[PDB]
Amino acid sequence: PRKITIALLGLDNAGKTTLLNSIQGEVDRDTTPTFGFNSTTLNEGKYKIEVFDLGGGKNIRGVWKKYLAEVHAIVYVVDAADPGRFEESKMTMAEVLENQFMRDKPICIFANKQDLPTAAPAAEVVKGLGLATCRNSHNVFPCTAKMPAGQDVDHRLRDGLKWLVGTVDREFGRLDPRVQTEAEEVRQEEARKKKEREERLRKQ
Amino acid sequence: EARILVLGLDNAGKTTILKALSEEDITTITPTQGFNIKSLSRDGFNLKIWDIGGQKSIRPYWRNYFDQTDALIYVIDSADSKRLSESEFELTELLQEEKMTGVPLLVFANKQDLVGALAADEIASTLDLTSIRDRPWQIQACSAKQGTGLKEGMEWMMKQVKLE
Ligand SMILES: Nc1nc2c(ncn2[C@@H]2O[C@H](COP(=O)(O)OP(=O)(O)NP(=O)(O)O)[C@@H](O)[C@H]2O)c(=O)[nH]1
Ligand SMILES: Nc1nc2c(ncn2[C@@H]2O[C@H](COP(=O)(O)OP(=O)(O)NP(=O)(O)O)[C@@H](O)[C@H]2O)c(=O)[nH]1
Ligand SMILES: [Mg+2]
Ligand SMILES: [Mg+2]
């Protein structure tokens, strides 16, 4: 069984953590903002998926870059019901895709909060994120991460995961050795300039 | 009952936080010696906290209070420049500790009310938090002096505790 690594990105309040709970069937959990790291393992088909749940607030989202070398793909979540933020999300997503370690990796976009009256169609999200000129394979799934109490989770959550897995899968041959390598590189520089920082208060 | 460990460099603001969460007066606070028990009732749990000093001579005695720890709260002076690296080394030593395995980490980035106070994301980098893979962690910017951030930090912590 292959292991792949996925990052949950997208602005704060988009619904990353909630979607992560729902897709596991953990329905009655409520959520607080995320300001750090949180690993979670899922299974889809013949793949075992480790999911980094990260914060997207202004004061923590600059941390994303620290993880990108270790990932095969991104789940990018957008509050489709908050078009006032599409532009911010667009910049933010563009900046991720322009990262060296993001080449050739697919993005699964969730147009979340389709329950809300202001939910923009999956179509307007496309234009809003400038996906036509994007340089990565992508797909968009409208969804409702927070279904009402006593109702099944949105099946479009696993549909999107399935597509992302399928896409990583079709390219697993060149992508995975690339990720194992590049994650090792980043890991060892972060260690070495820690070693410098560490025994540079040997100072006594 | 949850066994909650609260550590950090001396002057980081451990006691001031603990007292603020306890609805007590913080106007005159003293550096801490010995091992003072604090009992917080929160979400139908009873939190057993040792309030401990973070002076260099006290730190080796930290090791004696690690057992069946349900959560680790770590306090940083966000506005104290030169001591940032010293704080990192001590937290690193803690996360290497065996009885800390899989223990949720809450970092209180304290004294956000001070000019020069680092933001969550730079603290996360200077403390090498972004290298962690084996535990869940929050960095919660806060000001014990002004009573901001504390309830939010504990809210996350209590979620991780009640999950287990
Ligand atoms: N109506 C509606 N509300 C939703 C939906 N999904 C999430 N929410 C709400 O949106 C808010 C943010 O959820 P959350 O999962 O914490 O977002 P996040 O992206 O993880 N934020 P952060 O990046 O700060 O951790 C919560 O109040 C949550 O209940 C949805 O599909 N519909
Ligand atoms: N500006 C500011 N000062 C704070 C804040 N919290 C605590 N302090 C101050 O920082 C100093 C040290 O606080 P203290 O609570 O003793 O820290 P400590 O970690 O308990 N020290 P020790 O390890 O020696 O017991 C005191 O002057 C305290 O009032 C805060 O949020 N803002
Ligand atoms: Mg979240
Ligand atoms: Mg003290």
Author numbering:
A (entry chain B): 17 to 220
B (entry chain A): 16 to 179
Report text from the authors:
The small G-proteins of the Arl family Arl3, Arl6 and Arl13B have been shown to be important in the trafficking of ciliary proteins and structural integrity of the cilium. As most small G-proteins Arl3 cycles between inactive GDP-bound and active GTP-bound forms and in the latter it binds specifically to effectors. Arl13B is an unusual Arl protein containing a C-terminal coiled-coil and proline rich region in addition to its G-domain. Here we describe a molecular function for Arl13B acting as GEF for Arl3 whereby the nucleotide state of Arl13B determines its catalytic activity in this activation cascade.
We thus co-crystallized CrArl13B·GppNHp and CrArl3·GDP in the presence of alkaline phosphatase in order to allow formation of nucleotide free CrArl3. The obtained crystals diffracted to 2.5Å and the structure was solved by molecular replacement showing one complex in the asymmetric unit. Although crystallization was done in the presence of alkaline phosphatase GppNHp was clearly visible in both active sites, suggesting that the structure represents the post-nucleotide-exchange state. The structure shows indeed that a major part of the interaction is mediated by switch I and II of CrArl13B which contact CrArl3 via α4Arl3, β6Arl3, and α5Arl3 located opposite to the nucleotide binding site. Further interactions are between the long α-helix α6Arl13B which makes a 90° turn at residue G189, and α3/ α4Arl3. In the crystal structure the nucleotide binding site of CrArl3 is not directly contacted by CrArl13B. We were not able to trap the interacting residues presumably due to the presence of nucleotide and/or the flexibility of the interacting residues of Arl13B. Considering the length of the C-terminus required for catalysis (see below) it is however suggestive that the mobile C-terminus of Arl13B is involved in the GEF reaction by contacting the relevant surface of Arl3. Switch I mutant CrArl13BF53A showed a markedly decreased GEF activity whereas the D46A, F51A, N75A, and Y83A mutants had only a minor effect. The charge-reversal mutations K210E/R216E in α6Arl13B as well as D103R and D146R in CrArl3 show no activity, as expected, whereas a control mutation H154W outside the interface has no effect. In support of their importance residues 212–228 are highly conserved among species and we would speculate that these residues contact Arl3 close to the nucleotide binding site.
